RNA sequence: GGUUGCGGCCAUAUCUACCAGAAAGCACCGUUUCCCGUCCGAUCAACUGUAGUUAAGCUGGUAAGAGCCUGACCGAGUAGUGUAGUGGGUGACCAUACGCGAAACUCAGGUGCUGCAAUCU
RNA sequence: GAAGACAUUGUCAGGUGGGGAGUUUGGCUGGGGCGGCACAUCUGUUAAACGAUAACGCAGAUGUCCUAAGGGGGGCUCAUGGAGAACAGAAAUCUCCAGUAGAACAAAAGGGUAAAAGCCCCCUUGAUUUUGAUUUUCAGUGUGAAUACAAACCAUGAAAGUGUGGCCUAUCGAUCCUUUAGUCCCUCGGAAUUUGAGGCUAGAGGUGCCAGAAAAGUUACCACAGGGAUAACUGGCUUGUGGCAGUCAAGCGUUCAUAGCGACAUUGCUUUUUGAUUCUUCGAUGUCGGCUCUUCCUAUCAUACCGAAGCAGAAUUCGGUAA
RNA sequence: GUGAUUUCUGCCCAGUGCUCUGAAUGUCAAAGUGAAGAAAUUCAACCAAGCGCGGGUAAACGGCGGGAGUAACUAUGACU
RNA sequence: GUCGAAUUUGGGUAUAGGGGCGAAAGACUAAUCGAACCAUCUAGUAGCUGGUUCCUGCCGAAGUUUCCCUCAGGAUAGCAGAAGCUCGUAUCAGUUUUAUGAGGUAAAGCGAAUGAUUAGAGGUUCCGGGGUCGAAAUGACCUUGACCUAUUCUCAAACUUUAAAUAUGUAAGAAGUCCUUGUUACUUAAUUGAACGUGGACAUUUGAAUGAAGAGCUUUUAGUGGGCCAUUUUUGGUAAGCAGAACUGGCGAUGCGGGAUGAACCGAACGUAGAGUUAAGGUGCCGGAAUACACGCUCAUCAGACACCACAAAAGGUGUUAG
C-alpha cells in the first residue's frame, strides 16, 4: 500500500483537504495528540521544551505516529508516566494522490493515498511541559522522536512558563497578586476592560491590597 | 403549455390600427400541391435512368416543434401570425391553475 | 500525432511593430446613436441661426 | 431495462468473477481478470435482454519468450432503448411484415427479444435485435409522459385470446373531473382489471406535438385520442 | 467543454460589499450628467438592468448621450495593433463622475486668477507645476538634542 | 436650545440593562351614523379633542458594557513582494544589494453630524 | 395431323433479382481500436487580485417547464428556537416572545432580494405593431442572447411611474424545396376575362458531426503515394515497481535488546525486472533459443590467509582481504 | 450433400429459408369505370401477381439452458 | 514415389479475358494471373516524395486569431516588402510624476459568517440512553454523549471580516476659459433650460517630467499558419532530455571571445584596414599573462580543484581547528 516517503516529501501541489468535492479520504494514522498527565494545573509543570522543525517539508501521518510512541515510551519508563504533558501540535489535513491504475496517460488523474502535514521553518512539532529537575529525560526522549522524521529538526528549551504566553518572571509578577486564575487545562488573566460587575464575580483575590 | 382561446392585441388593417379581439386556434401545415415549380422540376429529374438524383434526409435530432398561432381580428377578419417556444404538450381554452391542490389517488 | 494547441507567445512583440495607435479625436462627432427627439430639434435649430445670419448678412 | 437487469443479474448471480465495477453516464463498466469470465456474462446477457456487442483489443508486452504476448480485451454491449411501457410508432415495411400489425403500438414484455401489443385491436408481434439494429428507430413517448385519468364504466364487446380484452372504457381526466365538462371514450386492452372509479395512467395524444417522421406518415384521424398504459 | 457566458468569472466582482446590501441612496439619482463629463464605471449588483459587461469594470470614458434613465459613455478598447471606439448605454447606478477632472477644473480658475492678478501686480507669472526638487541646506542644532549611539544586538531564540 | 412635517450622509446613529423629561408638539387614548375593511371597528376607514395620561412610544442621560468609528517612536520597517549577481547550499531552501510595504495583536479616545419650512417659557 | 383467336410477338405497368454493375462505409485521440464528447452551450475552479488564456484537468449542468411560474397594484414576513393551550405523543390546529434571513425565489452552480424580487389577493395580456442603433462571443461576419431609445396602440395604479416575456448569468439553426399571413399590390412579354403558375415582405417544416455530404462489412491473396509528424525490437532520460545496502530496533534467542534470527518505519545505490515516454531508425541496424568462443564486473559458491560465535571436539553459522 | 466395409444415425418446424390439390376481402400499379368542374384537373368505387394469414418440411440453414419446492440431512440423466 | 492402367505420349481439332479451363491449389490461360498481352483515351489525377541553372546592394518574417468531413491542406486577420500621396514642428510615446479609479492573488483570520478540528474546566435535564434507591412520580444518587458558557490545539484551489507588492483605466487646456444675448417643431408653471452660435476679453511659462532620423493617409502583393529553449509562476504525473498553460528574454534565421568539447549558458551581436582600451574568462607547463603579495585551513592505503554541468544522502568519527 505505502510508497516511500521520499516521493511525497516536498510541498509541490496546493492544499487539497477533505471536502464535498474530494469526499473519500483514508483515516489518519495519528489519532490522539495530547499524552502524559493532561489533567494537570499550570503551576505543576513550569519547564517547557519544544521540538522545532528546520525545513519546509511534509511529515506524513505515520512519521508522527512512530515518533509519538517512541518519545512517550522512553519518558514513561524512565521518569514515570505522570511526570510530563506531551502535546503533538501538528495535525495532518493535506491529502496525497497516487496514480494507481485505455493507455497510460490517456486519462490520468490519481486516487487518494494518505494524509500528511505541511511543516515550516521554525514551526513547533512536539511541545512538552515538565518539572524543573526532569529536563534530561525530556531532551533524550525527543532525541529518539527525531530519528523517525526526515529532514532537520532541533530541540529548544523554552523561556516561557509551561504552555503560557508569558516569561518565567512575568508570570510570577502577576500570579502573586490576584491577576491570574486557573481555567481548567490552561489559564485566565484579569482584564482592565469589560463590565466591572463580572470582573468582581471572578478574580476574588484582586481588589483588596492585603494578601 | 396552455393558452386562452381569445387574445386582445394590436390589429393592423386600415380600418383597425388599435387593440381589438382576436380569435386563436392553431397553425396546420397546408398540402403539398403538385404543379408547384419544385415538384415539376423534381418529377422530371427522377424520370429516366440514373437512380436517386437528390439527397434523402435521415439523421434527425429534434423532438419538438414550435407553436404558431393564427390570430383573426373579429371585426375585420384580418389574420396575423405569432410564434412560441418549443414544448412537448400544448392545448388551449380552459384547464387553469388552482390555489394549492395536493396530489390525489 | 498531437499538436501544440494554444499560446500567446510573441503576440505582444508583433503588436508593437506598428504602434498600437489611438483612433483620432474629431471636432464634431456623429449623431448616429443619439436620441432621435433631440436631433429632430437640432436640425430645425441650425436652419434658423443660418437663416438669421443669412438675413443679417444680406 | 438497466434497473431490471441489475435485479435479474442478482437472482441467477453471474457476478463474482469481476475485480470491480465502475459507472458511466448511460450504463456501467464491469472489469474481469480472465477473458473466459467475461464471455459467460455476455452469453448470460444474450439470454435475458436484447443486445448488440463487439470486442476489440490492446497489446502491451510481446515477450520474445512465447506463451505471453499479453493482450487486453474490451466488449462494448448496447441494450435496445425501447423500454417496457413506451408508446411506439413502427416503420411501414416492418409493420406490414410482422403480422400486418398497425404502426401505432405499445410494448408488451421486453425479454430476450422485444414484443409489441396493439391496445385497441388486441394483437401481438415480435422484433429480434438482429432485425431491430439493421434499421433502428426510437420511442414516440416515454414513461415520463403519462397522465392520470379516472375510469367511469367499461363496456365489454367480446374477444379473449388470453387477457379478457377489447373493453370500451369510458374515462375522464383527473384535471378535468373537478372542473369543466369533457369525457373521452376509448377501446382498450385493459378489460379484465378495470373497474369504475379507478385511477389509470396513459398517454393523452390530443395535446402532444411530436416530431417523428414515422408518426408524420400516419392518418391524423385514425389515431386514437387517448391510450391508457396501466391501471393504478 | 468550455464556458464563456456573459457573466462568467464575476463571483466577487458584482458582489454587494459587507453591511451595504439593499436599497441605493437617493444622492445617486439626484446627480446631473451632461455631454462631455468624465465618468468611472462600477457595476452595482442589485440593479440587473442597464448593467455593463465585466470588461468595462474600472474603465473611464466620456458622456455622449443622455436619455430617460441612462447615459451614453464612450470607451476605448484595445484589440491587436489597434484601439476601437465603443459605445455603452448604462443606467445611472453603475456610473459616477471622475474626481480627477473636477480637480483639474478648479486649477483652471486658480491659474486664470494668477494671470489676472499678475498683470495688476506687474510682470512675471511662472504657473507650471514643478516636480519635487532636491532639498536645501540647514543647520540641525544639538541644543537639547545630543546624538544617541546604537549598536547591533546579539541573537536570542525566544520560542 | 427643544419639538413637528419633509430630508442628506446611513450604528460616533445599533443592541442589553438602568435612570430623567418644564413648555408646546408628538403620542397612547374616546366613539361606530356615514365612505370603507375585517372571523373580530384589533389593524385599516370615518367622527370627536370631547372623557383621561406621561404609565408605554418619543427625547436625552448613565455603564473600568457588547458592538461600531478614528488614531498611535503599538505590533513592524516584520509577513509578503518588483528588480540583481559564474552569491551560499547535494537538495529542500537561505543570505546579501537597489526599492515597495500589510493584517491580526496591543494601547488611546469617541458614542450621531447637518439642510428647508413651521412652531415653543 | 394437333392446337386456335388462346398462345407467340410488340409497348407500358407492378412484383422478384449479390446472378451482375457503380459507390460509400465521420473527427478528436499520450500509436490505432473500444469507451468518452473535451464535436454546439452554461456555473464554480485550474486562472498567477484589469481583460485574455491549455490538457481525454477537477467539481457539476443543457436540448426542457410556465396564461402564470408574464405585466401592474395592494396586503404581509420567512428558516428555526423558547413559553402556553381537552383527545394530541418528536410531527395536526390556536396564542405569545426572540429571530439580518440561518427561509423562499420551475431546474446546475454563483450573485441578487425584507413596508421585497419572498408568501396571499384584485385587475390583466407589453409574451403586441413599425423598423433602425448598441453589447457579448468576433474576422468587430453570421447564429443565439441581451441593452437603451424612437414612432403607434394598450395594461395597471389616487398618483409619481412601471411594463417590448420568464430577478441575473444557459435553454438553440443558412442557401435550395414546401407552406402560412400580408399587399389582395407586380408578371405570364399580339390583346383580353376567369382557372393555374410565378414574384415582393414577414413566420414555420432541419440539419446535436449544432457556419448545416445522401452512405455496411471483409482481406492471413493484396496494391500504390508517403510517414521515423506514429506503433511492434537495440539505445537514451525516468525508477513507481523489482533487486541490493545501511540507520532505529518490536518480538525472539530458558536468565539475558545488539553471537545470531530478525517486523515495521526512515536514508540511499543499481539498470541483470517491469512500467512511463516517443529523441534516433519505416529509399529496411536480420526480429527467440541452443551450439561455438573470447574477454570484463564483484554484489565471492569453491579454492589462500584471517576476525567473531549462545566456537569442548567434530560438524556449522556470521564478518574481513581477494575475481 | 456425405464419403469403402461393420453398427448406428436421437429430440426440435419458434427463427431464416424452401414449399402448399389450403383461407379470402386485409393490402394493392398502369389501363379502364363513376362523380365534381368551362377545361386543364381533382375525388371515389373496382383490382393481377406478390405481401400478410393457415398447414408441410431438419440426410434444408441450424439449435439441443435455467430456476425454485418434494415432513431430518440429501435433491438425482428422478417426480412438480 | 509409381511402373498394365482414373497409365505415358506425337499430330489434328474445340473452348478467349469479368471470358475460358479447373479430380478445387485462387491453380492454369507463351519466364506475365485475387482478372493475360498490344495500341489508344493519356502530358489521366496527387492536399504526398525529389529537383528547380548568374553577381552585388537595401529592407526583412512566421508557427498565432476565427471558419472549413478541418488535424501532413485551404480561406481569414496578423507580422514583411514595394509604390506612393497630403503636410512639415508634428502631435505622439512597450517610460516617469502629480491627481484620481478599478481588482480579492501573496500574507492574515477562524476566543469573526461558511466548512473542517485537539484538549480539559464550569453548567443544564420533564427531553439519545445505562447503572444505584425504587409501587409510581414533570423523583433523587452516579454516568456517557448531545447542545449552553467563557477557554484552548490545527487548517481550506472550489471559506472569509482585513488585505499588499508587481501588473492595469482616466485627466494635466486653443478643438480651451470667461462675458455678451441670438436660433428651436426638443424641455420648462415661466425664454427657464438644453445643444450649436454672432460679437467682445484672454497668447508663446499656453499651464507636470523625459524624449522625438519628422506627423498622418491610401493602394497592392510575397512567405508563414509542425516550433523549441531558459529565469520566475504553475496544472497533470512517483518521476522524465515527459504532457499542458502564464509574462519576459532567446535559438530557429547568428558568426565572433569565454564554458576543453556542445542550437539555447556568460560576454558581446559582424562593410574594408591601423593604433589604443577592455568584457566574460584567466596568469606552474601545454598557452599569450605574477612558481605575485597577504591571513588562515586541510594530508586523504578512492584528497581536492570554479556557475548552467554532466550527481550523492540519512547516520557516524578522543582526526584536527575555532566556538
Ligand atoms: Mg421508368
Ligand atoms: Mg498547430
Ligand atoms: Mg483540443
Ligand atoms: Mg429582464
Ligand atoms: Mg378602539
Ligand atoms: Mg385611523
Ligand atoms: Mg415614564
Ligand atoms: Mg465600550
Ligand atoms: Mg438485387
Ligand atoms: Mg443482385
Ligand atoms: Mg458489388
Ligand atoms: Mg482518425
Ligand atoms: Mg473512439
Ligand atoms: Mg482575470
Ligand atoms: Mg415572477
Ligand atoms: Mg406568350
Ligand atoms: Mg427556418
Ligand atoms: Mg428544413
Ligand atoms: Mg470494399
Ligand atoms: Mg488479419
Ligand atoms: Mg486461401
Ligand atoms: Mg499465388
Ligand atoms: Mg519520434
Ligand atoms: Mg541506407
Ligand atoms: Mg549489421
Ligand atoms: Mg571486493
Ligand atoms: Mg445434407
Ligand atoms: Mg475427403
Ligand atoms: Mg424451426
Ligand atoms: Mg420454418
Ligand atoms: Mg413453418
Ligand atoms: Mg408458413
Ligand atoms: Mg506463365
Ligand atoms: Mg507535368
Ligand atoms: Mg537589419
Ligand atoms: Mg461540413
Ligand atoms: Mg513532410
Ligand atoms: Mg478568483
Ligand atoms: Mg493564504
Ligand atoms: Mg485561493
Ligand atoms: Mg491550420
Ligand atoms: Mg513532444
Ligand atoms: Mg524551419
Ligand atoms: Mg547570437
Ligand atoms: Mg565543462
Ligand atoms: Mg545574466
Ligand atoms: Mg607563458
Swiss-Prot record, chain A:
Family, as annotated = Belongs to the universal ribosomal protein uL16 family.
The record's InterPro entries line, in alphabetical order, gives: Ribosomal_uL16, Ribosomal_uL16_CS_euk_arc, Ribosomal_uL16_dom, Ribosomal_uL16_euk_arch, Ribosomal_uL16_sf
Q: Where is it predominantly found? A: cytoplasm
* Role noted for this protein: Component of the ribosome, a large ribonucleoprotein complex responsible for the synthesis of proteins in the cell. The small ribosomal subunit (SSU) binds messenger RNAs (mRNAs) and translates the encoded message by selecting cognate aminoacyl-transfer RNA (tRNA) molecules. The large subunit (LSU) contains the ribosomal catalytic site termed the peptidyl transferase center (PTC), which catalyzes the formation of peptide bonds, thereby polymerizing the amino acids delivered by tRNAs into a polypeptide chain.
What is the name of the protein in this document?
A: Large ribosomal subunit protein uL16
Q: Which GO terms describe its biological process?
A: cytoplasmic translation; ribosomal large subunit assembly; translation; translational termination
Q: Which organism is it from?
A: Saccharomyces cerevisiae (strain ATCC 204508 / S288c)
Question: Pfam families of this UniProt entry?
Answer: Ribosomal_L16
Instruction: Show the GO cellular component annotation of the record.
Output: cytoplasm; cytosol; cytosolic large ribosomal subunit
Record localization: Cytoplasm
- PANTHER family membership: 60S RIBOSOMAL PROTEIN L10 (PTHR11726)
Q: Position of cross-link Glycyl lysine isopeptide (Lys-Gly) (interchain with G-Cter in ubiquitin)?
A: 39, 100
UniProtKB/Swiss-Prot annotation, chain B:
**What Pfam families does the record tag this protein with?**
Ribosomal_L44
- Would the keyword Cell membrane be found if you checked this record's keyword annotation? no
Coiled-coil ranges (or none): none
> One GO term of the cellular component aspect?
cytosol
- Give residue numbers for the modification (N6-methyllysine): 39, 54
Among the GO molecular function terms of this UniProt record, one is: structural constituent of ribosome
Q: Which InterPro entries match?
A: Ribosomal_eL44, Ribosomal_LSU_eL42, Ribosomal_zn-bd
| Signal peptide start-end | none
Cysteine disulfide partners in this protein: none
Give UniProt keywords alphabetically: Antibiotic resistance, Cycloheximide resistance, Cytoplasm, Methylation, Ribonucleoprotein, Ribosomal protein
Q: Might you name a Gene Ontology BP term for this protein?
A: cytoplasmic translation
How would you describe the post-translational modification of this protein?
In wild-type cells, 78% of L42 is monomethylated at both Lys-39 and Lys-54, and 22% are a mixture of species with either residue monomethylated.
> Main localization of the protein?
cytoplasm
Compartments it resides in: Cytoplasm
What does the subunit comment say? Component of the large ribosomal subunit (LSU). Mature yeast ribosomes consist of a small (40S) and a large (60S) subunit. The 40S small subunit contains 1 molecule of ribosomal RNA (18S rRNA) and 33 different proteins (encoded by 57 genes). The large 60S subunit contains 3 rRNA molecules (25S, 5.8S and 5S rRNA) and 46 different proteins (encoded by 81 genes).
As a miscellaneous remark, the entry gives: Present with 13600 molecules/cell in log phase SD medium.
Concerning PANTHER family, the annotation shows: 60S RIBOSOMAL PROTEIN L36A/L44
Q: Report the protein name in the record.
A: Large ribosomal subunit protein eL42A
Name of the gene: RPL42A
UniProtKB/Swiss-Prot annotation, chain D:
Name its cellular compartments: Cytoplasm; Nucleus, Nucleoplasm
> Belongs to which family?
Belongs to the NMD3 family.
User: Subunit comment for this entry?
Assistant: Associates with the 60S ribosomal subunit.
Task performed by this protein: Acts as an adapter for the XPO1/CRM1-mediated export of the 60S ribosomal subunit. Unlikely to play a significant role in nonsense-mediated mRNA decay (NMD).
Q: What's the miscellaneous note?
A: Present with 11900 molecules/cell in log phase SD medium.
The record lists the organism as: Saccharomyces cerevisiae (strain ATCC 204508 / S288c)
- Please indicate which part of the intact protein appears here, giving the first and last residue numbers and the full length: 170 to 401 of 518
From the Swiss-Prot or TrEMBL record, give the protein name: 60S ribosomal export protein NMD3
From Swiss-Prot, chain E:
Q: Which Pfam families match?
A: Ribosomal_L21e
Ribonucleoprotein found in the keyword field: yes
As given in the record, the signal peptide range reads none
Superkingdom field:
Eukaryota
Q: Which UniProt keywords apply?
A: Cytoplasm, Isopeptide bond, Ribonucleoprotein, Ribosomal protein, Ubl conjugation
The record's annotation in InterPro entries points to:
Ribosomal_eL21, Ribosomal_eL21_CS, Ribosomal_eL21_sf, Translation_prot_SH3-like_sf
Query: Which compartment or compartments is the protein found in?
Result: Cytoplasm
Statement: the UniProt record of this protein carries the keyword Ribonucleoprotein: yes
Q: Name one GO biological process term.
A: cytoplasmic translation
**Main location, first listed in the record:** cytoplasm
What Gene Ontology terms describe what this protein does at the molecular function level?
structural constituent of ribosome
What does the entry list under GO cellular component?
cytosol; cytosolic large ribosomal subunit
Gene3D superfamilies to which the protein is assigned, alphabetical: 6.10.250.3260, Ribosomal protein L21 (2.30.30.70)
Binding partners and assembly: Component of the large ribosomal subunit (LSU). Mature yeast ribosomes consist of a small (40S) and a large (60S) subunit. The 40S small subunit contains 1 molecule of ribosomal RNA (18S rRNA) and 33 different proteins (encoded by 57 genes). The large 60S subunit contains 3 rRNA molecules (25S, 5.8S and 5S rRNA) and 46 different proteins (encoded by 81 genes).
Role noted for this protein: Component of the ribosome, a large ribonucleoprotein complex responsible for the synthesis of proteins in the cell. The small ribosomal subunit (SSU) binds messenger RNAs (mRNAs) and translates the encoded message by selecting cognate aminoacyl-transfer RNA (tRNA) molecules. The large subunit (LSU) contains the ribosomal catalytic site termed the peptidyl transferase center (PTC), which catalyzes the formation of peptide bonds, thereby polymerizing the amino acids delivered by tRNAs into a polypeptide chain.
